[PDB]
Design a binder for this molecule. Structure first.
Ligand code: 2CJ
Ligand code: MG
Length: 284
């Protein structure tokens, strides 16, 4: 059990803690691929959580500088300014894999922006945000999940990232509203005559359900497009990625069964995840 094992085990802990579903699927990858996934995940999570450490951009700028050190000198010893365990594991991954560093920088830029968040005028802006926060992370994962990356591999991974984000949005409407965030676009809220504050106070209605289902149908079509292009990924990652997906599709059903409540977080029971993987894996 080396120092490097401990760094990876820490990254695992972070991923298990903050996303049971992704944890459940990507943990099924062969050992060197899953460890690379944990490290990427943990870095992205730290970026996502950085503003609330002191309440400003300090820690986020140290994370960015750590990443830039790795990118510029992948083989030098660095005294990392942010979370050393995570940055050592990332550096280890970078020595073995072609990481898209600009995709971490895009992610970090989306975080800086989110300090002065203003609602999206249009869906194009919402989708731009899903790229920023999640398509970027798909791009970063691409060399880990495929043998030979082409632009298609990046395109599928990116679309998978964004459609997972859209599903998070649709699950978390109420919690996000409490945190003063609404991610549905002003254009689409206006068109469907929906006011989130009003829906949070008074319950769902038919306009809200129609708005929600509008975006659910986008996520679902994107998901089918990903599944039809599953073979861009390595054979070992294909059932894993198919499973990660299927579980997020199921989140949409969990929301509908809970009548679109804006007052709790719904989830796919662990035993249900094991059932989806049985279903998938029978066909692998
Ligand atoms: O709970 C929450 O608030 C949100 C959760 C985390 C989450 O949904 N995302 C969406 C993007 N995935 C990417 C990813 C990064 C690293 C490893 C696996 C997956 C990804 C991007 C692209 C392709 C696949 C996967 C990471 C962050 C935690 C609870 C479950 C949903
Ligand atoms: Mg959200």
């Amino acid at each position: 059990m080396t120092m490097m094992d401990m760094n990876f085990k820490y990254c695992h802990k972070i991923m298990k803690k903050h996303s049971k579903s992704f944890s459940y699927a990507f943990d099924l990858l062969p050992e060197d691929q899953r460890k690379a996934v944990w490290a990427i995940y943990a870095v992205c999570r730290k970026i996502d959580d950085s503003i609330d450490v002191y309440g400003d951009i300090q820690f986020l700028n140290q994370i960015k500088e750590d990443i830039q050190s790795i990118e510029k000198y992948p083989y030098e010893y660095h005294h990392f300014q942010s979370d050393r365990r995570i940055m050592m594991a990332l550096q280890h991954v970078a020595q073995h894999k072609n990481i898209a560093f600009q995709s971490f920088y895009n992610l970090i830029d989306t975080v800086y922006k989110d300090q002065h968040f203003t609602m999206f005028e249009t869906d194009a802006e919402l989708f731009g945000y899903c790229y920023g926060v999640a398509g970027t992370v798909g791009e970063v994962l691409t060399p880990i999940l495929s043998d030979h990356e082409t632009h298609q591999t990046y395109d599928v991974a990116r679309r998978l990232g964004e459609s997972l984000q859209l599903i998070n949005i649709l699950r978390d409407v109420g919690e996000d509203f409490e945190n003063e965030r609404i991610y549905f676009s002003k254009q689409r809220l206006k068109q469907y005559e929906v006011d989130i504050a009003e829906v949070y106070q008074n319950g769902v209605n038919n306009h809200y359900i129609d708005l929600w289902e509008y975006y659910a149908a986008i996520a679902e079509k994107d998901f089918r497009d990903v599944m039809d292009q599953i073979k861009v990924f390595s054979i070992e990652a294909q059932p894993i990625i198919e499973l990660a997906a299927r579980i997020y599709i199921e989140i949409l059903d969990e929301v509908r069964q809970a009548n679109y409540t804006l007052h709790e977080r719904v989830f796919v029971e662990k035993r249900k995840k094991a059932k989806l993987f049985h279903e998938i894996n029978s066909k692998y």
